Amino acid sequence: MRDAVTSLIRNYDTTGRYFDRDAIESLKDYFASGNDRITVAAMINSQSAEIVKAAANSLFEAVPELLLAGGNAYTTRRFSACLRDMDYYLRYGTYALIAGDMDVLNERVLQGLRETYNSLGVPIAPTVRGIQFLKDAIKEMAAAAGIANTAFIDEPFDHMTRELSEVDL
Amino acid sequence: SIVTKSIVNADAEARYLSPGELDRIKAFVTSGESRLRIAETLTGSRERIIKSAGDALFQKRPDVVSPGGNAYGEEMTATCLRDMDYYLRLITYGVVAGDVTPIEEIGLVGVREMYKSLGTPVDAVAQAVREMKAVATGMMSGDDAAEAGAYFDYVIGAME
Amino acid sequence: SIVTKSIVNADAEARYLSPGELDRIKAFVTSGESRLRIAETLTGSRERIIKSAGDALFQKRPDVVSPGGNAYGEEMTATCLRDMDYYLRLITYGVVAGDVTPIEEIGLVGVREMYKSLGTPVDAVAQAVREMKAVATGMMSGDDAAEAGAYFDYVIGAME
Amino acid sequence: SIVTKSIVNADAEARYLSPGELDRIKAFVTSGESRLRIAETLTGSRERIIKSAGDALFQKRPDVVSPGGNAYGEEMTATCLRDMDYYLRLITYGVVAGDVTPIEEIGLVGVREMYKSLGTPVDAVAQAVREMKAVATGMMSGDDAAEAGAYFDYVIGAME
Amino acid sequence: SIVTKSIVNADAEARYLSPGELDRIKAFVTSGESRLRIAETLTGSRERIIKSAGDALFQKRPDVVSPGGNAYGEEMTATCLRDMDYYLRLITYGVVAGDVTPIEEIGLVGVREMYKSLGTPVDAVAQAVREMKAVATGMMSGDDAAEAGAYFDYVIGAME
Amino acid sequence: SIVTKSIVNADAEARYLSPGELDRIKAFVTSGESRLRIAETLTGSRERIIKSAGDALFQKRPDVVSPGGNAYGEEMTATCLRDMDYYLRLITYGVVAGDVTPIEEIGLVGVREMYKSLGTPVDAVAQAVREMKAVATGMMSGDDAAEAGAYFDYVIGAME
Amino acid sequence: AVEYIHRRLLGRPTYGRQEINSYFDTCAKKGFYALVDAIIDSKEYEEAF
Amino acid sequence: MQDAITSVINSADVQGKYLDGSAMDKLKAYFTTGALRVRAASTISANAAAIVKEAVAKSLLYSDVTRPGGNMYTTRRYAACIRDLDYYLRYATYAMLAGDPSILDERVLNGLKETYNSLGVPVGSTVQAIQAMKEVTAGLVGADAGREMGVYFDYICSGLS
Amino acid sequence: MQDAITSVINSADVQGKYLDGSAMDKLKAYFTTGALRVRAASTISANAAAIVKEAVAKSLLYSDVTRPGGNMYTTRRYAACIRDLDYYLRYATYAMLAGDPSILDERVLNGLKETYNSLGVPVGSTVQAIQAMKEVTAGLVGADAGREMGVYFDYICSGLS
Amino acid sequence: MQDAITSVINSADVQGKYLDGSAMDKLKAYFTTGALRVRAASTISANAAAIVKEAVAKSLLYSDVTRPGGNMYTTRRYAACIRDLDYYLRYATYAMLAGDPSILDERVLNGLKETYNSLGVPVGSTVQAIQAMKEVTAGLVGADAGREMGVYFDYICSGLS
Amino acid sequence: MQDAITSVINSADVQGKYLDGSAMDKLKAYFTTGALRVRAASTISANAAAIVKEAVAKSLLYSDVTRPGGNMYTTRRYAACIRDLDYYLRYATYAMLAGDPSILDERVLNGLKETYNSLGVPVGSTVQAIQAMKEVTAGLVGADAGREMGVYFDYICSGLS
Ligand SMILES: *[C@H](C)[C@H]1/C(=C/c2[nH]c(/C=C3N=C(/C=C4\NC(=O)C(CC)=C4C)C(C)=C\3CCC(=O)O)c(CCC(=O)O)c2C)NC(=O)[C@@H]1C
Ligand SMILES: CCC1=C(C)/C(=C/C2=NC(=C\c3[nH]c(/C=C4\NC(=O)[C@H](C)[C@H]4CC)c(C)c3CCC(=O)O)/C(CCC(=O)O)=C2C)NC1=O
Ligand SMILES: CCC1=C(C)/C(=C/C2=NC(=C\c3[nH]c(/C=C4\NC(=O)[C@H](C)[C@H]4CC)c(C)c3CCC(=O)O)/C(CCC(=O)O)=C2C)NC1=O
Ligand SMILES: CCC1=C(C)/C(=C/C2=NC(=C\c3[nH]c(/C=C4\NC(=O)[C@H](C)[C@H]4CC)c(C)c3CCC(=O)O)/C(CCC(=O)O)=C2C)NC1=O
Numbered sequence A: 001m002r003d004a005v006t007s008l009i010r011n012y013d014t015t016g017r018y019f020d021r022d023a024i025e026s027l028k029d030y031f032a033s034g035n036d037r038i039t040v041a042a043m044i045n046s047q048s049a050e051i052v053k054a055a056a057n058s059l060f061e062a063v064p065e066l067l068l069a070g071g072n073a074y075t076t077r078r079f080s081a082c083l084r085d086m087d088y089y090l091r092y093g094t095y096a097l098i099a100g101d102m103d104v105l106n107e108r109v110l111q112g113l114r115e116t117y118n119s120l121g122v123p124i125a126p127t128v129r130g131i132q133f134l135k136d137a138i139k140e141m142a143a144a145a146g147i148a149n150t151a152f153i154d155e156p157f158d159h160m161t162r163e164l165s166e167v168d169l
Numbered sequence B, C, D, E, F: 001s002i003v004t005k006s007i008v009n010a011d012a013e014a015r016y017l018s019p020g021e022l023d024r025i026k027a028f029v030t031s032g033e034s035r036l037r038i039a040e041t042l043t044g045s046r047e048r049i050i051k052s053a054g055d056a057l058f059q060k061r062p063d064v065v066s067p068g069g070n071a072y073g074e075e076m077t078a079t080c081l082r083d084m085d086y087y088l089r090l091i092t093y094g095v096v097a098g099d100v101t102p103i104e105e106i107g108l109v110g111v112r113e114m115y116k117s118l119g120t121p122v123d124a125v126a127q128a129v130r131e132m133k134a135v136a137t138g139m140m141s142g143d144d145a146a147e148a149g150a151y152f153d154y155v156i157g158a159m160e
Numbered sequence G: 001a002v003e004y005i006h007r008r009l010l011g012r013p014t015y016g017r018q019e020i021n022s023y024f025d026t027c028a029k030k031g032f033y034a035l036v037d038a039i040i041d042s043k044e045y046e047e048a049f
Numbered sequence H, I, J, K: 001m002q003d004a005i006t007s008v009i010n011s012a013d014v015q016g017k018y019l020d021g022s023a024m025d026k027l028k029a030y031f032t033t034g035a036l037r038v039r040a041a042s043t044i045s046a047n048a049a050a051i052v053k054e055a056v057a058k059s060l061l062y063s064d065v066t067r068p069g070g071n072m073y074t075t076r077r078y079a080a081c082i083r084d085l086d087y088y089l090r091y092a093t094y095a096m097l098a099g100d101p102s103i104l105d106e107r108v109l110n111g112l113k114e115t116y117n118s119l120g121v122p123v124g125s126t127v128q129a130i131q132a133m134k135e136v137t138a139g140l141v142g143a144d145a146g147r148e149m150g151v152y153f154d155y156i157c158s159g160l161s
């Protein structure tokens, strides 16, 4: 896995150069916003099982077929599998919120997710809309808790739904 | 780094980050300023560190520069100082990252196999990092010398 | 968009962007504010556009809602208004992007094959976009109506 | 006919006609009386077939005879029955030819393009030839109905 | 076969099987019983066909069995009768399949290159198949002799 | 000749003649007397060469003179010797040309097709030109025999 | 078959997906004869040969 | 690419034997079923677009795959899906006429799994679409012609899965 | 490219009428000729090489053409001559099968005249060879089909001259 | 191939949602940086050959790779090296204008590693050449335009390594 | 996995024939060369690490691949490179002892190209490393033992390329 620091370290290592002015400025930029990420992560660790359920109910209010007959969140086995999947998305979104880099999401979530979902019949679309219902919930909850900047909260879910995304453009 | 190690250690355990690990990440996040100061101290004076450490090494272990040793000749001594420069760069990376996974994960895993394939005595390389540690901790304040000497200590420990 | 088209057209030619293409991108960058205003005008009043355009379409072409036509019944008329909503959304995308490559690259390439496989008259769909254009250019100022009617014009032209 | 198609096949393969397709031409030669009887019965009752098939088509799909539809009015319905006359005429030509190629040359190349120009729904024409097929095979004996229904089936397959 | 040829010829044209090709396959399907009877006639009396045809060939073309020819000696004459047996077997395959694509696709493509590399006169092989055709069409009824002589005719035609 | 071939080579490559092939034409010009001597000796003893080579061919391959073979009878054997006369004539033309191209233009393009028509075994003709080669190189001096045997070798190579 | 016929008649492999979605669409609605006709039509054939 | 006749001839030729009674019986079975194969092929050639659009109307319409995010979303993807289903029906008709599925694994099932896995095409949804196409054409041509169509439709679904 | 059937359909199509009884009369005339047309076509296809070799052995062999000084001297020109004769016989067989000489005017006699003037091919020797081939195929396949081949060979000669 | 605008639209479309405030803020960020992107693209289009030749003069000249045995030895290899560096600078300019590196891994970094590994091209030396090109163009266009050029130069070096 | 003896036996068994004189001559050739194979295998087992480190000192050292950015850069990559070269020398010794390269394409060259292409390993640089290993061991064991080592080294380089 990579955080932002090991990203800069691997970036400078492949050319064999030391840190310049700009590398120290980007490391200061990660270390200055570190406390903000950590109180956001602790506030998510407060209400994880609540946020996952609320994002799930907002997703099922969005796409109503999945609770109904032909949908994929049909039975309670499928309902519990979908809510555990949303718990996975919030967990690795917290991990990428603390790390500040998208390599944990790429190595442990997004690599080969589409294969499993296309095979099992799990749809990819309401998965993404549920991921960003989680993102919107986290964003307004942490903007309510005195935190000025929300770009780092914006980062990992936007990456996760740029990757599961179907490129049609 | 610290964040990578905490994330992976919570990741195998199928749990979130425990609050103790979270204040560990928080304390590392606060101490990053002193880490960057130690990194600028190590980066800006690399010429004198490599020069004085090579001088004290070849004073201490003269057989590797004598005919018959590995670092005998102009280009071989230049490659020897280049290897010392590599290890000082990895020391700076480990100082910034707050953990030795840059140093170990770049330049310490197959170091015995590589230096055995080159024909190099690894104890003399440990003496080179020892002289680098002496010059570097002679260059800083007390707690800064202790925090840099932790990573220098890890490199000499991972040699032997 | 404009930037994609300029980059690709310089990209095949193995050259950089010519300065005329660069002031084209600059003029599009300056006109983006008016493009976003037209997009908010089209986005905020989508209910009345879709409703009035469906009303004028079924007034104009009553056979597709008569028994025997495609959009006969409750759910079929709902799907018809949904297809009109899709095309108004693509109109908004083409208004923002400054070019018709969103509209063409999403909902105009195999439109003939799709609507032939569904059993749909494509001229009645062109009349639907015509009524959408009438309601939309009845909703704006002059130059705004011309700039939106360019993309509405492209959709009706790409139908037939 | 079958002879022109066998000749262009032996020409593109640059060889003489195989005894298999010589036997095919000979069997076609002997079955000339049966196909003459089929085309005779079809040329006999063309008006009754067209009237029953047109009323069955208008009963099935009323969108074409509705206001705003294609075949609205006396002359438009008469031209619709004229197009059904042309298609039954080509059906008789292909029935007496033993091949579908005169139907292809005269009335199957650009029917989608020209009906895209006139505004005629092509699936409605496929339904019209479906009703003509059902009525003509209702008139014939079952083996001859199978033969004529092969060519009718080919026409509705090339339609939709 | 016939079905392979019809499927491929409709397959390149991106269309289904035309109804004329379908009654071609149907007529071949009905004539398969007479094809199997001709095949049993050719299969059961292969000894007398090969023996009498070799006798009439060496009577007709004695130089290939004279010293200096290809089929001179015991094993060479045995290989000559074996090649005639191969061609009678391919004749039986082409009789069953209803087309010459077994015969051509097995034993007629590089027949000139093979028999030129062996040093064989190909006209004498054409005379061998001619005598095989004489003995075989002397063995059957009229239409059966014509249908088998079509494939024998194709083999002698593909020789020269 | 060599000059026409160098000219068509410089034409297809769209340049003037290189000094290498100018030196080739000059060396060909100086070696004209040797090739005149070779063609002189061949035009001298053509009957003896043809008689010994034809009897050697008939002794080697008796299939052509056997009953049922190609060259059976007085006129057929005389035409066989006439074809050997044509080939020795083209050998002399190519010997005096310095190139194999008049042999190619006059007697090497369609010899397989025309001998496929007449029924002549082409490998027997290759044996005939082999015997003509052996006899003519037996007559010549060894260096000139090598030159004439190059063209004879080319003819039997283009035969088989 | 699209790829090998393209390598035979144009002398190069295909570049991407559009190029293959466009030639196999000509193979779709019209067939192999129009595939050869569309490869021989192309501006790269005209400019190259 | 070989029908029942060419496969029987290939077996008897790889044996090197003449056509014995079992081969004669196999060819008699094919020559009895061939007229039914011809009539079913004509009936399927009649209603290609209707069978395809009824298969989409049964399975793929109004589900998530035609919604945003689905692989059948755009008009390009819809046209390519109709194109793929027309291919499956056309080659199932060819394999029905030949009486041998060699054309299916020669010319459909050759690189189809790797193509669909590289594009991101759902294989289960297209298997359900082919199954609905099979159900519609078996309702069209009857019981036994529908069965001899469904054996090659099941061959395509098995090679795709 | 038109048959007797396609020419009948074409003539009834230019004036614009349907099929009349006289068209059916021409069609039944074509069929009752067409059965023996098939058998004669199989006989000509069986023996084409012997027919061409007897044609050249009858007329062209011991003349100045197959000798030096003629246009049939070299093996290149001899192979081209045999190929020209094979093509005349094959297209005459196609015209015999179709019952219409439109193929001979369409594919054979299109530009054959001017290339025969430009290459210096003798028209008279070719016409003699075609007529020799005509009575060779007449003695082979029979009398009525001999007349059938006769008018199409004569069509080729009239387009040539 | 997508800029910042098309990627924002693609995210909002794969969601199926309308453009909310975060997308509006991202597009406002791009519409503020676009004029600086335009001016840096003009300044880079001014000095293509100068930036390339200064990158070779910094890194690759007078080293072993221009000596015999090096992969930049011959004039063909030198011309191909200048061509490759011009490609890297041109596509870095394109990715700077789009504000998204999708064109780089679509059209540069696609088969570049396997091509360079098959040819024998040193990847470290060309990474150092791209780094010197980045250093020269960041000296050319300033601090922040040099940084937004260097992010795509680092993208090319990371995908190459 | 088969030596010269097992391949000769497999050929005679797939024939179904007994061991004729050509098989006896092949086995006599192997039984004459076997002592030289044994002594060369002992001499190569003596100096495994020396041959490997001399191959790296000839080809891969002081080039770009041991510099930053190269695929042989880190200590992990250096150790894996020494491991890969030890594998090539060990399996070339095995194929020299067997007298048949079946073990090489069974157990080295099976998925090696796809592994190296997935990892980003340069194939030309490792082919040059195997060639230098061949040159060093042919200097070690002599002319003819070096040749019968180099035939399997060339087999590994040909299957890798
Ligand atoms: C829920 C909102 C959506 C949904 C979910 C759904 N998923 C499954 C089954 C599985 N999901 C996964 C997913 C992951 N595994 C991982 O390792 C990661 C990264 C951490 C993810 C995201 C896996 C592996 C399975 C298979 C079951 C298993 O874990 O062994 C189902 C069950 C499908 C079924 O019918 O069996 C469901 C319902 N479905 C929806 O409709 C929502 C959009
Ligand atoms: C086949 C057996 C089976 C059942 C029954 C089942 C039920 C089921 N009931 C649900 C919710 C619910 N069910 C109810 C109501 C009720 N629930 C009851 O059993 C009472 C009859 C009734 C109250 C009197 C309500 C109000 C919700 C919404 C809960 C929420 O907001 O999360 C949900 C969550 C998804 C949804 O909103 O529908 C499931 C999966 N799953 C199964 O596999
Ligand atoms: C960042 C992690 C890392 C390390 C450590 C590293 C070492 C490394 N050291 C090398 C050589 C060397 N390194 C030394 C160094 C020494 N010999 C002595 O006697 C002294 C004790 C000691 C240094 C103080 C010498 C002499 C050589 C040359 C060996 C030879 O030429 O055979 C080489 C081969 C040539 C080259 O490409 O540089 C590598 C790859 N590479 C790496 O990527
Ligand atoms: C964004 C680009 C895009 C378009 C255009 C699109 C169209 C689309 N239109 C459909 C149906 C339809 N669309 C119409 C629309 C019309 N019929 C009429 O008579 C009117 C003229 C016209 C609308 C005003 C109707 C009636 C259907 C239902 C067809 C059926 O049920 O057979 C369906 C199948 C059901 C579904 O999944 O929605 C698609 C995919 N999908 C897309 O992704």
Ligand SMILES: CCC1=C(C)/C(=C/C2=NC(=C\c3[nH]c(/C=C4\NC(=O)[C@H](C)[C@H]4CC)c(C)c3CCC(=O)O)/C(CCC(=O)O)=C2C)NC1=O
Binding pocket: E064, E069, E070, E071, E072, E076, E077, E079, E080, E081, E083, E084, E086, E087, E090, E106, E107, E118, E120, E121, E124, E125, E128
């Ligand atoms: C099924 C298609 C097929 C054919 C035709 C075929 C022919 C074939 N004929 C051969 C030999 C031969 N075939 C002949 C036949 C003839 N020579 C004459 O003079 C007669 C005119 C004529 C037969 C009536 C002779 C003499 C040989 C031996 C050639 C030699 O020994 O050099 C051989 C080489 C030895 C062998 O393996 O049998 C092959 C492969 N193989 C095939 O798979």
Ligand SMILES: CCC1=C(C)/C(=C/C2=NC(=C\c3[nH]c(/C=C4\NC(=O)[C@H](C)[C@H]4CC)c(C)c3CCC(=O)O)/C(CCC(=O)O)=C2C)NC1=O
Binding pocket: F064, F065, F070, F071, F072, F076, F077, F079, F080, F081, F083, F084, F086, F087, F090, F106, F107, F111, F118, F120, F121, F124, F125, F128, I061, I066, I067, I073, I074, I075, I078
């Ligand atoms: C200069 C290029 C050239 C060639 C090659 C050529 C060949 C040629 N060979 C002929 C005949 C012939 N050629 C042969 C020759 C042979 N058959 C055998 O038995 C022998 C093995 C072989 C002799 C090597 C025979 C037997 C005939 C007469 C064929 C017949 O009358 O059926 C004839 C027919 C008579 C004539 O018009 O002179 C020509 C034109 N003419 C040319 O102008």
Ligand SMILES: CCC1=C(C)/C(=C/C2=NC(=C\c3[nH]c(/C=C4\NC(=O)[C@H](C)[C@H]4CC)c(C)c3CCC(=O)O)/C(CCC(=O)O)=C2C)NC1=O
Binding pocket: G020, G021, G022, G024, G025, H060, H065, H070, H071, H072, H073, H076, H077, H078, H080, H081, H082, H084, H085, H087, H107, H108, H112, H115, H119, H121, H122, H125, H126, H129
């Ligand atoms: C003749 C043998 C053969 C087949 C079958 C074949 C399929 C094939 N289907 C494709 C795409 C496709 N196939 C589908 C089909 C589907 N996706 C869905 O969601 C549905 C479940 C399913 C339809 C029932 C779609 C939507 C695409 C377009 C993918 C895209 O544009 O991103 C592509 C990508 C390139 C292109 O569209 O033109 C190929 C090569 N190619 C062949 O040569």
Ligand SMILES: CCC1=C(C)/C(=C/C2=NC(=C\c3[nH]c(/C=C4\NC(=O)[C@H](C)[C@H]4CC)c(C)c3CCC(=O)O)/C(CCC(=O)O)=C2C)NC1=O
Binding pocket: I065, I071, I072, I076, I077, I078, I080, I081, I082, I084, I085, I087, I088, I091, I107, I108, I109, I112, I115, I119, I121, I122, I123, I125, I126, I129
């Ligand atoms: C399908 C209709 C069709 C025909 C008929 C046709 C004929 C045709 N005959 C040709 C030559 C020829 N045709 C002959 C003909 C003859 N030998 C004689 O002297 C006799 C008068 C006659 C033998 C019966 C000769 C000698 C040449 C070659 C003359 C030369 O170019 O050297 C050529 C020039 C290319 C070639 O060398 O073959 C064409 C195109 N092309 C066609 O597409």
